[PDB]
Design a protein around this ligand. Structure first.
Ligand SMILES: [Cl-]
Ligand SMILES: [Cl-]
Ligand SMILES: [Cl-]
Ligand SMILES: [Cl-]
Ligand SMILES: [Cl-]
Ligand SMILES: [Cl-]
Ligand SMILES: [Cl-]
Ligand SMILES: [Cl-]
Ligand SMILES: [Cl-]
Ligand SMILES: [Cl-]
Ligand SMILES: [Cl-]
Ligand SMILES: [Cl-]
Ligand SMILES: [Cl-]
Ligand SMILES: [Cl-]
Ligand SMILES: [Cl-]
Ligand SMILES: [Cl-]
Ligand SMILES: [Cl-]
Ligand SMILES: [K+]
Ligand SMILES: [Mg+2]
Ligand SMILES: [Mg+2]
Lengths: 237, 234, 248, 233, 239, 230, 244, 204
């Protein structure tokens, strides 16, 4: 079996394989997460459009358990591996603790999986970041982010993938108690945030919500373009 | 150049650069001195302190009641080797109910440390040891190297500027056999002091001492416990 | 030995996996292979490369593989690699049937193989498999289905798609002619020939030069059939007759 | 390109030297040991107002009597921290006593050079850890602060900075430290020094501080307790 | 670069990594073995690199079985490991077959082990050559020499290390077939003093061992007084 | 322990050059011919046999796998011996389970699968051989080629080794569907004569046949007889 | 092509652009490093192996300098090329033959032993991590049906049986000498087999031997056990040749 | 006895250009009947069936695992498996568990997929194959079944006469066995059709 050391240090303390995995993430479709007051929302760009595609089969938003879901940006095949590993783990937790995972527990687990693939022989790092959202047993809403290095943090809102710099700038100016006071406004904040980067708005924004206890709902194109117009016409005034 | 990255690559002059390079790890450690009389084996070591507020690195380690070591080079490799030596000593007392003879333990270090010098992707141990022991053949000072070679010594110094210590030790070695313990440690300290910049002196913060002999299990002296030995370097 | 390791499973400086990309170039040169979804079934149509006169014609197809009772596939790329993968697909499908006593849903079979391909890009120091696959099938969850997978371990569902030589061109023609929700197997067959005729531009299209398989449902049972040459000639005839109308 | 266990002509392992350079990319952390207890203080380094500051943890409890501050590649620290935690619990299980700060630091440091690509199990460590650690606690030797870097070298320090501004911070520590210094003085000293060296204006959310005292278990300062200490400074 | 692995032939059919290992042996000081009427005698020019070393440190003469001596040149850690291999082989032989290993068979077995380190990128060749000597009433005196490629031959006289050729030309002057071990020790000491370059390397110890009728087939260090008599004879012969 | 990385990889244009280079070893090997007649199969090959000092009967290029299946090759002989041994072993494993001789196509599939492994597996090069495999089963003759990539093809007739391209066009203007075996043997030997150089004896070619009775090498005296016309 | 090279195709056993294996080619050059030549010839009644015996050093025990080896009581061998490689191959052959007898209850045929060693050598041409052995093995024995046998295998893993053959520096010349001689002989078969072998060797080297400068080994239909000729025995042949 | 734990009986019988295979329908655990429609005969092809008596868990496992192997065989080969080759496949499968066997003893009945020639055989629990030209039996009432078959079977029976014979052999044999019965199912296999019947039968 293959034992080559793949992720190694360079002069100045760089881990080049990890930096390169991070470049793969920067070329993924834009993903956005906002933690609301009693809701969490994930929105993600495109990726390709293409009329002949079966839309169902390429989603970048994914249930991990009833109370935790995730979006990713980067190498989609890599993301699938992470997602399935996390899904298995959620069931082990339930098995041995008889509670669902906290969002932090499963984030911590995904992050340490990723970190291991930066320090084990024979393997390259995963080329993905993840936005992980849900609710803890006591109702507290949560948004976490992981990256290829295994680092993770909690966020009020965030973006990953292409144009994440500019979307994050927008969330910084626009994430207020007012902007998330209600469910529709929280959803609108995700869409406005994408509508800044999303090439042919929009059209190709996929979007999903999780409510306290209520489990992942994906919005359909009919439900989305309701919000799109309801915001596009408000910005004329 | 093409010959210096792998311990399995002989150079065209019949050298192994990786082993030579591992030996530089020991030349850059802080100096330690080992010497012996008819009855005792002594180790003396200089401790390098990182900053003024750091304690000073341990240089001397207990192996068994009859054996201790002084280290120079990579500390993590020193501990790995020290743990090997400890285990070999415990095994011998478990099996035979007597101390492992010092020369036999040193043979085991040679055999153990030679192995990674001959396999691809392994590396030499980057540590040299001075080994003080006492057994049926009396006191001993042995030296081990990253090359896996080892030496039975009247006295020895390794580490930075140890050439001065070696010289002092040659100058006075004909005295050592007949020295009492105090004279012998004094000699060890004088040799170690030769390694220091003209400014600087032996202090209770930077000197560590290890002693074993006929009447005495391997004992380590640090900090306030070295003051008896430092006073009356007269 | 580090000197001789070409390092097939590492990132490049742009976050790229060169062996995967290079494998995708291999595929681009292989025989053109298309898949079309209809309301009453699904088809595969592929360019044959085994066309030399002295070849012997011993199996029921060249590049169409039955996977289990309800599914088939075709391939573009390294043939021997495709034989390893199609053998693995059959194994997975029987493991599923053993365990659950029901056929593997189409997307589940595709995903299981794509996880093997993904592994080959992440660990093991091996070259990836030089294959893209088109998968056709029926299951009780989503009925008639068409999937595409490639050496990265990525896949997707499609209503019509193409891999191998002149794919980009083929997909433009499909984009233009395909009627979502309104295709029959008969019209998809017509479109398939139309597409191959344009994309085998070296040269004049012959039944000996293509293979078509269809997948349909009859009396609660999946039927998977490779069209006989008489039927392929008849379809080519009808396409040429159709272009006779084209101006007046 | 060369193997991960290659010595340079100066007798150092390239990978370890490079891991030592990665420590300089970390936030600054400070440890001070007094006769009344040890304190640990760390710059959080908030990169966006959207990030939750409490999700940054660069000081962690090892056991009730031992905390740990880290700098460098933080993801690498997790397995070291977990190893420390497991070791102290094993010691407790086996011996029914608390493990010394020194012993914990030693056990963690034995992981240091355990990397390489053809001695070991199917996918063991490919490289060293890009982390430095300050272990601060109280055992029967009294209060204690130990430093450890990627070489596996560890040592007791009366006061020590690590991370980006550690030269700097270490100078100021030489200046202010004295053996008879109180814990409350050490707390103030380390926040004054962090305040100098941090790019951002020190406040009660972009730092952490913890203490361990002979009296009292590992204690992370609250926002409220930080503000009270920040008033003087 | 055709000279970095023992698993690579050069275009002329050479294995440079074995040749380079041989160069390590040829940099070492000289060891000699001489077979005679009633046994085998070994001598080594043992350079003293520090006056701080104990007399007897870094022995280059080893007992590998009670009836077998080994004399080495080249990288000493490699040589010691080979002495361990040889010991183990002699031991296993006795456990399996129930008698003392024949010298020739021990030489062949260890040479195959040396040979195994000349085929692969995974390992490097041993940087040592060594002689094996024994005596018994049944087999007579036997002296074998093994080099880093793993070749093994028997000899009447042999030298290894850096004054190899000079040593051989002196050995050739002896009618060793008709001499006893007691006569030959003095001649071994003599030859070591002849080939020793006293200008280039200052201090050496003479190391002497033998096996023969006179030791009852046991490999033993030459006794101190006989060694000193031999040295005195050698030194005075140099005059 | 062994190298765990592939020695065959994709080039920037999508080629596995080690396999191409293996194919060049095949193209440089001695010529081999296979013709499927109506009632059998003939395999024929040239002995690259210098010296009268060779004992021509000491090693064979035309080899039996089973009672009903046989092989020949172009390319590297020692590589061929590996594959002969594996084919034989694969045939036996099949027979132990199924109690029926392995169908020619099933044998070709399993052998080709082995050749594929050597294009991807750690620390090995591909086989520098192409095989022609003949057999008789389901009352019918079969001729297959298996190449260094692990690709295989069913032929009516073909050639491999030096000058194979011409050999192929020579067969194209000479093979018919309804040809008998005795005739096919003649055209096989004529096809080798095209690219021979040296004058043909029964000692420097080898011929194997496959029919309802099974597979066997022709004997020197039998080859002598076919050569008298040629 | 015509001596082209890509990547590591001169360092490890991968194909060159012409489909060559340079490392295997180079192993054949290694056979000549030793500077020795060997000859083997078979007749109806016996098979003989002759090689040079060079003892440049007076201080060698010349009884230990040989390239003739007994593999079993009935199979002999001459080795040509790198000495330590050759010895290893001898051990392996001895092991393969002993193992054959244990499993199958009869002596390994010479052809099968040669084949097995050749097959083992083949692995070193296809796997990258070790080199081929730079040596060549010639085996003799009596087969009950086929009579005396001479087989040779090489670092490429090729093997063949022969009427006569050679190995080492003057292999080509020996091959020509032997070819010219068999054509002359009826039923293309050697009859004066020890004489032909020694003459061939002496011609191609231009030496005219003393009985201490060659070694001779034999197997015969009447006496199938492998036998090494003594000096005196060899001398009787050298003298019978001197006088015609 | 492990094989009487569930009880049960199967048999197969040859006629002119047809074969028959039959089984009782009880699934019981020692004395207790649990169900009366338990499947013991499984199609391995259009004209090829395997009947398994013995331990009910192994009946099901062997049927399922055999099916796994057969599907892969058929996908890989050109073709539908031959009766004799199925027997060998089954033999090999059972003998792999030589030192910890499945507790089932199958019978096979079919027609060759090309020739349509009749085939029947049975195997013991470790895979010893036995082909016959008349009949085979397996289960807790084998002696009863042998008595009925030896007395009633004749060569070259047509489908209607074969049906009556196998039915009477089964019904009367199981009616002397406490742990077999609760119904009998019969498949008659011909070139052009399968005929499947359940029999009026004692339910005690
Ligand atoms: Cl893992
Ligand atoms: Cl990002
Ligand atoms: Cl040091
Ligand atoms: Cl260190
Ligand atoms: Cl040294
Ligand atoms: Cl030193
Ligand atoms: Cl199926
Ligand atoms: Cl299925
Ligand atoms: Cl630092
Ligand atoms: Cl030498
Ligand atoms: Cl490897
Ligand atoms: Cl074989
Ligand atoms: Cl067979
Ligand atoms: Cl034959
Ligand atoms: Cl035996
Ligand atoms: Cl003659
Ligand atoms: Cl199974
Ligand atoms: K090789
Ligand atoms: Mg009943
Ligand atoms: Mg009842």
């Amino acid at each position: 079996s293959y034992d080559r050391a793949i992720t190694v240090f360079s002069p100045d303390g760089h881990l080049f394989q990890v930096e390169y995995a991070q470049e793969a993430v920067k070329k993924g479709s834009t993903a956005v997460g906002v933690r609301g007051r009693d809701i969490v929302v994930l929105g993600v760009e495109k990726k390709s459009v293409a009329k002949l595609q079966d839309e169902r089969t390429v989603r970048k938003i994914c249930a991990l358990d009833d109370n935790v879901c995730m979006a990713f940006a980067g190498l989609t095949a890599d993301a699938r591996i992470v997602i399935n590993r996390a899904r298995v783990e959620c069931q082990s937790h339930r098995l041995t603790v008889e509670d669902p995972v906290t969002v932090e527990y499963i984030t911590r687990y995904i992050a340490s999986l990723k970190q291991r693939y930066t320090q084990s022989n024979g393997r390259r790092p995963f080329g993905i970041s993840a936005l992980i959202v849900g609710f803890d047993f006591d109702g507290t809403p949560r948004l976490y982010q992981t990256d290829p290095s295994g680092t993770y943090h909690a966020w009020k809102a965030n973006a990953i993938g292409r144009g994440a710099k500019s979307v994050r700038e927008f969330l910084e100016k626009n994430y207020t108690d007012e902007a998330i006071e209600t469910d529709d406004l929280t959803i609108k904040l995700v869409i406005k945030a994408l509508l800044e980067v999303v090439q042919s708005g929009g059209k190709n924004i996929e979007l999903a919500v999780m409510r306290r206890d209520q489990s992942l709902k994906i919005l359909n194109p009919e439900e989305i373009e309701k919000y799109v117009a309801e915001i596009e016409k408000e910005k004329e005034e | 150049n093409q010959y210096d990255n792998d311990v399995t690559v002989w150079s065209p002059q019949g050298r192994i650069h990786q082993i030579e390079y591992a030996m530089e790890a020991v030349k850059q450690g802080s100096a330690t001195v080992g010497l012996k009389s008819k009855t005792h084996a002594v180790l003396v070591a200089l401790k390098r302190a990182q900053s003024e507020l750091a304690a000073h690195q341990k240089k001397i380690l207990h192996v068994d009641n009859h054996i201790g070591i002084s280290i120079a080079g990579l500390t993590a490799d020193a501990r790995l080797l020290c743990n090997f030596m400890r285990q070999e000593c415990l095994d011998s007392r478990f099996v035979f109910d007597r101390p492992l003879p010092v020369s036999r333990l040193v043979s085991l270090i040679g055999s153990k440390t030679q192995i990674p010098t001959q396999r691809y992707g392994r590396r030499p141990y980057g540590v040299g040891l001075l080994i003080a022991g006492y057994d049926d053949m009396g006191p001993h000072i042995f030296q081990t190297c990253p090359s896996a070679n080892y030496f039975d010594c009247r006295a020895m110094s390794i580490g930075a500027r140890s050439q001065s210590a070696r010289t002092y030790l040659e100058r006075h070695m004909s005295e050592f056999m007949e020295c009492n313990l105090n004279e012998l440690v004094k000699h060890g300290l004088r040799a170690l002091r030769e390694t220091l910049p003209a400014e600087q002196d032996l202090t209770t913060k930077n000197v560590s001492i290890g002693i074993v002999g006929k009447d005495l299990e391997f004992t380590i002296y640090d900090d306030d416990d070295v003051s008896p030995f430092l006073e009356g370097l007269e | 030995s580090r000197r001789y390791d070409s390092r097939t499973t590492i990132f490049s400086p742009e976050g790229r996996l060169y062996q995967v990309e290079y494998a995708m170039e291999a595929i681009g040169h292989a025989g053109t292979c298309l898949g079309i979804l209809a309301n009453d079934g699904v088809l595969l149509a592929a360019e044959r490369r085994n066309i030399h006169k002295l070849l012997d014609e011993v199996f029921f197809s060249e590049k169409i593989y039955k996977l289990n009772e309800d599914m088939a596939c075709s391939v573009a790329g390294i043939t021997s690699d495709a034989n390893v993968l199609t053998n693995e697909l059959r194994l997975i499908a029987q493991r599923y049937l053993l365990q659950y006593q029901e056929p593997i849903p189409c997307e589940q079979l595709v995903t299981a193989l794509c996880d093997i391909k993904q592994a080959y890009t992440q660990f093991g120091g091996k070259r990836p498999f030089g294959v893209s696959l088109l998968y056709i099938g029926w299951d009780k969850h989503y009925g008639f289905q068409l999937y595409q997978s490639d050496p990265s371990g990525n896949y997707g569902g499609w209503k019509a798609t193409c891999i191998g030589n002149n794919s980009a061109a083929a997909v433009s023609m499909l984009k233009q002619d395909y009627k979502e929700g309104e295709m029959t197997l008969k019209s998809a067959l017509a479109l398939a020939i139309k597409v191959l005729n344009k994309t085998m531009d070296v040269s004049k299209l012959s039944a000996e030069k293509v293979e078509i398989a269809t997948l349909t449902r009859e009396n609660g049972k999946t039927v998977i059939r490779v069209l006989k040459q008489k039927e392929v000639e008849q379809l080519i005839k009808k396409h040429e007759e159709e272009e006779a109308k084209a101006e007046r | 390109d060369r193997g991960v266990n290659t010595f340079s002509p100066e007798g150092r392992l390239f990978q370890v030297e490079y891991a030592i350079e990665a420590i300089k990319l970390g936030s600054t952390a400070i440890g001070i040991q007094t006769s009344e207890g040890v304190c640990l203080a760390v710059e959080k380094r908030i990169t966006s107002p959207l990030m939750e500051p409490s999700s940054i943890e660069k000081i962690v409890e090892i056991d009730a009597h031992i905390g740990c501050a880290m700098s460098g590649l933080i993801a690498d620290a997790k397995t070291l921290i977990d190893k420390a935690r497991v070791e102290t619990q094993n010691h407790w299980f086996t011996y029914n006593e608390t493990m010394t700060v020194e012993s914990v630091t030693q056990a963690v440091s034995n992981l240091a050079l355990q990397f390489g690509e053809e001695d070991a199990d199917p996918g063991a460590m490919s490289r060293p850890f890009g982390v430095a650690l300050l272990f601060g606690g109280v055992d029967e030797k009294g209060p204690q602060l130990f430093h450890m870097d990627p070489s596996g070298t560890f040592v007791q320090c009366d006061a020590r900075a690590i991370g980006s501004a550690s030269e700097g911070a270490q100078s100021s520590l030489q200046e202010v430290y004295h053996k008879s210094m109180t814990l409350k003085e050490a707390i103030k000293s380390s926040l004054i020094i962090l305040k100098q060296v941090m790019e951002e204006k020190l406040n009660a959310t972009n730092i952490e501080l913890a203490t361990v005292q002979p009296g009292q278990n590992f204690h992370m300062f609250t926002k409220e307790e930080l503000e009270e200490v920040i008033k003087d400074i | 670069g055709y000279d970095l692995s023992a698993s690579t032939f050069s275009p002329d059919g050479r294995v440079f990594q074995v040749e380079y290992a041989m160069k390590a042996v040829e940099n070492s000081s000289t060891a000699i073995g001489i077979r005679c009427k009633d046994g085998v005698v070994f001598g080594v020019e043992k350079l003293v690199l520090s006056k701080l070393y104990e007399e007897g440190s870094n022995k280059r003469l080893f007992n590998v079985d009670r009836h077998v001596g080994m004399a080495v040149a080249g990288l000493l850690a490699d040589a010691r490991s080979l002495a361990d291999i040889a010991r183990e082989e002699a031991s296993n032989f006795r456990s399996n077959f129930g008698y003392n290993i024949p010298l020739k068979h021990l030489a062949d077995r260890v040479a195959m082990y040396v040979h195994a380190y000349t085929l692969y990128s995974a390992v490097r060749p041993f940087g040592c050559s060594f002689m094996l000597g024994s005596y018994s009433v049944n087999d007579g005196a036997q002296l074998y020499m093994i080099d880093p490629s793993g070749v093994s031959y028997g000899y009447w006289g042999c030298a290894i290390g850096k004054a190899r050729q000079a040593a051989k030309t002196e050995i050739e002057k002896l009618q060793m077939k008709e001499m006893t071990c007691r006569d030959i020790v003095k001649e071994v000491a003599k030859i070591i003093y002849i080939v020793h370059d006293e200008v280039k390397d200052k201090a050496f110890e003479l190391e002497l061992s033998w096996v023969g009728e006179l030791t009852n087939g046991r490999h033993e260090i030459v006794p101190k007084d006989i060694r000193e008599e031999a040295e005195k004879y050698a030194k005075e012969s140099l005059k | 322990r062994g190298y765990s990385f592939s020695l065959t990889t994709f080039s920037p244009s999508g080629k596995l050059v080690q396999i191409e280079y293996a194919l060049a070893a095949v193209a440089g090997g001695a010529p081999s011919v296979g013709i499927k007649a109506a009632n059998g199969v003939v395999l024929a090959t040239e002995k690259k046999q210098k010296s009268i000092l060779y004992d021509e009967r000491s090693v064979h290029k035309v080899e039996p796998i089973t009672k009903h299946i046989g092989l020949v090759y172009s390319g590297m002989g020692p590589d061929y011996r590996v594959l002969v041994h594996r084919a034989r072993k694969l045939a036996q494993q099949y027979y132990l389970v199924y109690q029926e001789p392995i169908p020619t196509a099933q044998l070709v599939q399993r052998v080709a699968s082995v050749m594929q492994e050597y294009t991807q597996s750690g620390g090995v090069r591909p086989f520098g051989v192409s095989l022609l495999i003949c057999g008789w089963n389901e009352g019918r003759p079969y001729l297959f080629q298996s190449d260094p990539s692990g690709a295989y093809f069913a032929w009516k007739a073909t050639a491999m080794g030096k000058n194979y391209v011409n050999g192929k066009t020579f067969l194209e203007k000479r093979y018919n569907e309804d040809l008998e075996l005795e005739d096919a043997i003649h055209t096989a030997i004529l096809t080798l004569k095209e690219s021979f150089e040296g004058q043909m004896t029964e000692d420097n070619i080898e011929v194997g046949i496959c029919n309802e009775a099974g597979f066997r090498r022709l004997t020197p005296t039998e080859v002598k007889d076919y050569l008298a016309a040629i | 092509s015509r001596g082209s090279s890509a990547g590591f195709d001169r360092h490890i056993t991968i194909f060159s652009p012409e489909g060559r294996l340079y490392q295997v080619e180079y192993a054949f050059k290694a056979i000549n490093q030793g500077g020795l030549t060997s000859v083997a010839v078979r007749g109806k009644d016996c098979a003989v192996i002759v090689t040079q015996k060079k003892v440049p050093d007076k201080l060698l025990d010349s009884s230990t300098v040989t390239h003739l080896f007994k593999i079993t009581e009935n199979i002999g061998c001459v080795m040509t090329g790198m000495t330590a490689d050759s010895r290893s191959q001898v051990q392996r052959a001895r092991y393969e033959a002993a193992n054959w007898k244990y499993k199958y209850g009869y002596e390994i045929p010479v052809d099968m032993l040669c084949k097995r060693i050749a097959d083992i050598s083949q692995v070193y041409t296809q796997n990258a991590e070790m080199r081929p052995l730079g040596c060549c093995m010639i085996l003799i024995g009596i087969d009950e049906e086929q009579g005396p046998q001479v087989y040779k295998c090489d670092p490429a893993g090729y093997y063949c049986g022969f009427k006569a053959t050679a190995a080492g520096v003057k292999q080509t010349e020996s091959t020509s000498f032997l070819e010219k001689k068999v054509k002359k002989k009826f039923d293309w078969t050697f009859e004066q087999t020890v004489e032909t072998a020694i003459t061939c060797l002496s011609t191609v080297l231009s030496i005219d031997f003393k009985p201490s400068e060659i070694e001779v080994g034999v197997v015969t239909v009447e006496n199938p056990k492998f036998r090494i000729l003594t000096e005196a025995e060899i001398d009787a042949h050298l003298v019978a040749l001197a006088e015609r | 006895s492990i094989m009487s734990y569930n009880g049960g009986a199967v048999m197969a019988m040859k006629g002119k250009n047809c074969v028959a295979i039959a089984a009782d329908r009880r699934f019981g655990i020692q004395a207790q009947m649990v169900t009366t429609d338990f499947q013991k005969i499984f199609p391995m092809g259009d004209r090829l069936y395997i009947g398994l008596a013995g331990l009910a868990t192994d009946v099901q496992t062997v049927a399922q695992r055999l099916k796994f192997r057969l599907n892969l065989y058929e996908l890989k080969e050109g073709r539908q498996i031959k009766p004799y080759t199925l027997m060998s496949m089954v033999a090999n499968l059972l003998y792999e568990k030589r030192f910890g066997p499945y507790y089932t003893e199958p019978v096979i009945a079919g027609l060759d997929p090309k020739t349509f020639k009749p085939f029947i055989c049975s195997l013991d629990l470790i895979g010893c194959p036995m082909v016959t030209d008349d009949f085979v039996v397996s289960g807790t009432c084998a002696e009863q079944m042998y008595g009925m078959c030896e007395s009633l079977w004749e060569p070259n029976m047509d489908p209607d006469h074969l049906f009556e014979t196998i039915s009477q052999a089964m019904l009367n044999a199981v009616d002397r066995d406490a742990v077999s019965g609760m119904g009998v199912i019969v498949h008659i296999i011909e070139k052009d059709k399968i005929t499947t019947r359940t029999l009026k039968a004692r339910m005690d």
